Task: inverse folding
């Protein structure tokens, strides 16, 4: 028996957890699991201090005292409003992405400038309404309403309605991907549970995602 | 026309902003606007600190130095999975809400335990997975995968697909609502702008939401 305190990114929680919860019930029976959503900073801080046992993140921790393991890769996809000129195109054209109509998550897209081609593109901050601290939910709602463009995680596609799927435009190759990883402290003394968790989370997604597929590139 | 810093709760943003942005662009041309999503605690402190000028919250500030104006009332609705006993019912029923399969938002549903019935319901924590500080999006996805019950704000409905609309269950009267309000420093110096934002934000939602209708009760 025992208890497990695990954090999860807001840009992962909605897409991954629906898949994992049923799997935990059957495999992790006898264990009380406390799930919490945090952004990366909180995750790394909580891991170190011992506030949480594990953290599901979208990047390497690269933090003294912590370590992480690959769970799966996940492509970023264009979510393009029906009002954008780019809607008539089949793929996202970097050079046609209008900086003034782009919604970027500070940490979802621009954690250490991951999608740098957009995070640091000229004209980005030139618009009436600046949006900071925004959520994927908000951004998608905006796009669906005909305002702008944003980027959504592959795992969310199967959750999308027929109408929503129409807004999806993948990238031209190479396609941007983030890495979803399970982070802990180096001295984490539950190696067997850790091992079990890694397996369960990885089994929560299609195996194809376990490895970088030709045509995909880790966004840096 | 100047700069305006305005914060909005994560539980309101995705539902209100797509409505207002189109309005602000026409009516507030020339004014620089910086929107950021914040929780109620940060909104209040940021108002008192000057970091932000306005905050769209879901409660009365009830804080020395701050005041606020009503924008509109918004119903909480049941969001029930197809697997749940309640699914065959027409409306949410206190007694028949299984605390072990309920997803509640820290501030979204239990700000000062606004929804006391559920926020303080026996067994709410008797589960395998305690979900801390989850997002509305995550809870909605969990419900859509046949996992549990949550409550969502009325303004979300119009955004839902047909399928998602099948999961909606209204409360029996009195139906619980929250109040969405605009909060400012009592000494805020831009009065005309304040009055303009109050009118504009109220024009962003159906006028029937401006007042508390029959069968509705301000949750507390």
Result:
């Amino acid at each position: 028996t025992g208890r497990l305190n695990i954090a999860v990114l807001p840009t992962i929680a909605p897409y991954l957890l629906p898949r994992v919860f049923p799997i935990w019930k059957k495999e992790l029976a006898g264990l009380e699991i406390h799930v919490s959503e945090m952004q990366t900073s909180r995750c790394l801080a909580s891991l170190l201090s011992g506030e949480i046992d594990m953290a599901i993140i979208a990047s390497k921790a690269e933090t003294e005292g912590l370590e992480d393991d690959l769970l799966y890769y996940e492509e970023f996809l264009g979510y393009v409003s029906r009002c954008e000129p780019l809607f008539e195109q089949d793929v996202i054209r970097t050079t046609e992405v209008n900086p003034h109509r782009l919604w970027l998550l500070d940490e979802g897209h621009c954690f250490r400038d991951q999608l740098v081609r957009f995070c640091q593109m000229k004209g980005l901050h030139e618009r009436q309404t600046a949006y900071s601290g925004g959520s994927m939910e908000a951004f998608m709602r905006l796009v669906e309403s005909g305002q702008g463009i944003t980027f959504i995680p592959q795992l969310t596609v199967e959750q999308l309605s027929p109408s929503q799927k129409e807004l999806v435009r993948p990238f031209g190759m190479p396609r941007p991907v983030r890495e979803v990883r399970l982070a802990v402290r180096q001295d984490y003394s539950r190696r067997k549970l850790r091992e079990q968790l890694i397996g369960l989370l990885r089994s929560a997604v299609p195996s194809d995602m376990h490895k970088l597929q030709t045509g995909q590139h880790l966004a840096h």
